[PDB]
Design a protein around this ligand. Sequence first.
Ligand SMILES: Cc1ccccc1C(=O)c1c[nH]c(C(=O)NCc2ccco2)c1
Length: 347
Amino acid sequence: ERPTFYRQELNKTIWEVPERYQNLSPVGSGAYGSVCAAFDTKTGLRVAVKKLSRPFQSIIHAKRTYRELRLLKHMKHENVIGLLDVFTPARSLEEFNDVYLVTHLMGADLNNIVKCQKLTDDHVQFLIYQILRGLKYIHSADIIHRDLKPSNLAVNEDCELKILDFGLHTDDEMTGYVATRWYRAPEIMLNWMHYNQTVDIWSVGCIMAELLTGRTLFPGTDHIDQLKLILRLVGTPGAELLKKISSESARNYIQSLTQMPKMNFANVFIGANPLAVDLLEKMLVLDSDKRITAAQALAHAYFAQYHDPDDEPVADPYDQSFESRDLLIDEWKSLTYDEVISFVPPP
Ligand SMILES: Cc1ccccc1C(=O)c1c[nH]c(C(=O)NCc2ccco2)c1
């Protein structure tokens, strides 16, 4: 039943939230809205409360509000950000106009760790183990992240990690010397083909490299510069991959480059644990069909210390038949409402 809400101006707008949430402090905007840290007095947790920015302004907005909610409602894994609460001050569909999402707030992201302390090989094991464990889960529900990078990894005081912003940039946001593109699989970066979940394993290799060396693995100054950084390391594509690049235009550009062999990763990653080098070669394969999967990677010797086949769970089935559905604003909105109304908090 309905808790009492209180109002306050934050981030230049009125936030109206249940009493349980106290000490709301703006912490900068996230995916499609402003975020505040809060103390949840009912659970004792430090939480992130996101107020969605104009969630039903357009069809595109309405459907992405519905999508984010559906996604967050489905995720129930230690290494994936789940939904602690969702609420609206509206008392009926007629007055439904705002959506607030509540999740765990961790001390920092991986960006802050990568810059602010030295990572032992053990820290790299633990962190990558945790990303692959959440990724096996995500992938098992047939969801793709597409945008895995250190700023989408929430890490706490004890190096416990949660993945954020799965299954959700403008051409301008992908332009130039920008982290928003440094972790992207080449096939998605230059639209070579119909892409799948394997793109995610590529980003994991980029992240792992960077934890090991302290440096961005492919800090391209633009798409072409980055492509060259990638090809230098992994080699130009062979005949078999060229056929799978179904963009004739892109296939043709690729073919204009002088062929290069795959470099020796032991000389690229000097000092690195040999098991880590091996895993990097298995993740950083240009042919996406041949990259190691998350499930397979968890069973790689590098994670012997953490691997436990009985505690690496799969997801319940995720119905995203809505993705290919054409609905009006008021219909995505009604659907969203039903999802808010029927939310049951975690146990
Ligand atoms: C992903 C999400 C869904 C609903 C509400 C908020 C958010 C969100 O952007 C977010 C949730 N947790 C974190 C988080 O823990 N980030 C790590 C962090 C804290 C301070 C700096 O980085 C972000």
